Each structure stands twice: as structure tokens, then as C-alpha cells.
Design a protein around this ligand. Structure first.
Ligand SMILES: CCNC(=O)Oc1ccc(-c2csnn2)cc1
Length: 291
């Protein structure tokens, strides 16, 4: 799977909100482009003169993420974050010259991402009460991964002492994205666990935080909530469910070719962090079939 790389795998089956610190600093921002940020302003002006209804929005930038030594007390993860925008994304990660920018970042800063916006995404492995994960079919009319399979997520917009408010907004945003697209009531959802961070090598390495969320509704009940909103209540064009039993071997199915890179990231981390039992009981042959 060349189109996805794991930056972080969480310990303990996934980290809760109270175990994560963030450092939000202008030291964590994109570097100005070698020939100046004029190239970004040029791409933006051209795009608005074709689609004048488009609007910019602020985004969190991921610089790096450092895990504590395993088994330790106190905070287990530090996220170093900066600020970016949708406009900066269109002029760097989405640019035809994105690979040139990665090479120049390696040469100038020893950092392939130094000239890239790299907005932080969130995504969820969302499990039902009857032990299915939830999947969504992408519109064939949109610019990114048209017609591919996705999981619930998005790119959260800003608004350890500003740090803790930023971690709160990250965890909050994955619940809000599930309520907005799946049309589930907020009270049917568990507090998220962070499984890890995955990079999309088809979007010049922009990263998504991948979370596990449990729903108290069955697959049949989730389907009813999604459809009951009508075609205008969701950007996706269908919902479907795979038994958690069958997620273990998903990379060996014909479904794997239809998954967008950020959804591959969520399923890889779900398999490594929530699946893959460590103990004698869940490890026994009858409960963990070989091959
Ligand atoms: C940022 C919103 N995200 C969220 O709530 O989950 C989704 C999942 C998929 C799509 C989508 C876009 S085009 N075809 N599908 C939209 C939303």
C-alpha cells in the first residue's frame, strides 16, 4: 500500500483525550516558498475567477507527534501543531508541482513537508452495537477520490494552556463529523480513542488522526438515521457495513482497491490497535483463526 504510511501507532488500545498534550506554535507553520508565497496567491486568484463562491478556511497543521516511553505515567503523546488554510493547501499539497516542493524541502530544511500546508484531517473507525464498522460511498462529482469508499471524517477549523483546548476541539470534531454526515444523535456515541496518525502519499503526505468510536445503535438503526435525512442531509451517496470479523482480512478483498487512502489508514490502525489480541484468551485458535 504505497499510498498510505503510518506516522504513529498508539499504545494501550488507543489514547483518550486526557493523555494527549498539544503545543500550538508559529514554529510549527509551513516555511515560505523559495520564490515567495506569490505562487499560492496566483493559484487562488485563478480558482476564484472560475468558482467565485469558494471561501478560504483556517486549518490545523501537523508538524510532528512524539510518543512517551511505553508503560510510563503522565501524558503519553505530544502533538506539535501550527496553522494553515484551505488556500495554502490548494497552492502546495494539491499543486501539480507538489513533488518538486517535497524535494526542495529535503534539500533546504532536511524535511520533505517544510513547504507543504499539510492540514490535519480526522477520521473514525465507527463500530455498531451489533459489531459492524460503518463505510460511506463518495460522490462521483467531487475533485478528491471521486466515487471511492470512505469512513466518517473531515478537516477541523480552529475555534498545554491553549494546548488542552486544541486537543478538546480535535476529539469534539470527530463526533461532530459523525453527527453531521451519518445523522446519529450525539448521545449514541462513546468518547473517542486516538488509534494513530496516517499519511496520504497521493496528497503529498498530508496526515489524518484516526479514532475509534462505539455507537449504541445496531447497523439497521444507523442505516435508518442516515437515510431519514434525505439526499440533502449528506455529501456521500450511500452507507454500508462490514462485520468486524471480516475487517481483519479487508486488504485481501476487492473492496481494498475502492478505499480512499485516509480510509485505508483508519482500517490499518483499527486492525493493529483495537484488533490483534495480546492475551491467551482472545489469542486461542477458536477465537483467532490462523491465516
Ligand atoms: C468533512 C465532512 N465529513 C464528514 O462528516 O464525513 C464525510 C464523509 C464523506 C464525505 C464526502 C464528500 S464527497 N463524498 N463524500 C463527506 C463527509
Amino acid at each position: 500500500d504505497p499510498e498510505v504510511t503510518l506516522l504513529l501507532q498508539c499504545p494501550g488500545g488507543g489514547l483518550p483525550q486526557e493523555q494527549i498534550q498539544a503545543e500550538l506554535s508559529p514554529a510549527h507553520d509551513r516555511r515560505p516558498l523559495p520564490g515567495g508565497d506569490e505562487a499560492i496567491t496566483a493559484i487562488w486568484e485563478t480558482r476564484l475567477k472560475a468558482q467565485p463562491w469558494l471561501f478560504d478556511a483556517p486549518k490545523f497543521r501537523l508538524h510532528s507527534a512524539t510518543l512517551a516511553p511505553i508503560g510510563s505515567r503522565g501524558p503519553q503523546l505530544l502533538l506539535r501543531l501550527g496553522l494553515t488554510s484551505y488556500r495554502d493547501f490548494l497552492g502546495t499539497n494539491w499543486s501539480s508541482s507538489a513533488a518538486w516542493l517535497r524535494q526542495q524541502g529535503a534539500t533546504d530544511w532536511g524535511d520533505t513537508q517544510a513547504y507543504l500546508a499539510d492540514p490535519l484531517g480526522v477520521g473514525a473507525a465507527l463500530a455498531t452495537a451489533d459489531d459492524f464498522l460503518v463505510f460511506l460511498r463518495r460522490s462521483r462529482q467531487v475533485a478528491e477520490a471521486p466515487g471511492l469508499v470512505d469512513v466518517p471524517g473531515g478537516h477541523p477549523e480552529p475555534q498545554d494552556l491553549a494546548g488542552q483546548l486544541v486537543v478538546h476541539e480535535l476529539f469534539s470534531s470527530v463526533l461532530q463529523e459523525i453527527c453531521d454526515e451519518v445523522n446519529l444523535p450525539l448521545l449514541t456515541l462513546s468518547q473517542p480513542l486516538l488509534l494513530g496518525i496516517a499519511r496520504n502519499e497521493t496528497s503529498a503526505g498530508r496526515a489524518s488522526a484516526e479514532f475509534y468510536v462505539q455507537c449504541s445503535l445496531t447497523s439497521e438503526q444507523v442505516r435508518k438515521h442516515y437515510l431519514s435525512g434525505g439526499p440533502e442531509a449528506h455529501e456521500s451517496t450511500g452507507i454500508f457495513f462490514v462485520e468486524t470479523q471480516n475487517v481483519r482480512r479487508l486488504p485481501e478483498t476487492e473492496m481494498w482497491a475502492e478505499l480512499c487512502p485516509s480510509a485505508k489508514g483508519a482500517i490499518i490502525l483499527y486492525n493493529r490497535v483495537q484488533g490483534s489480541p495480546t492475551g491467551a484468551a482472545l489469542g486461542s485458535p477458536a477465537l483467532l483463526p490462523p491465516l
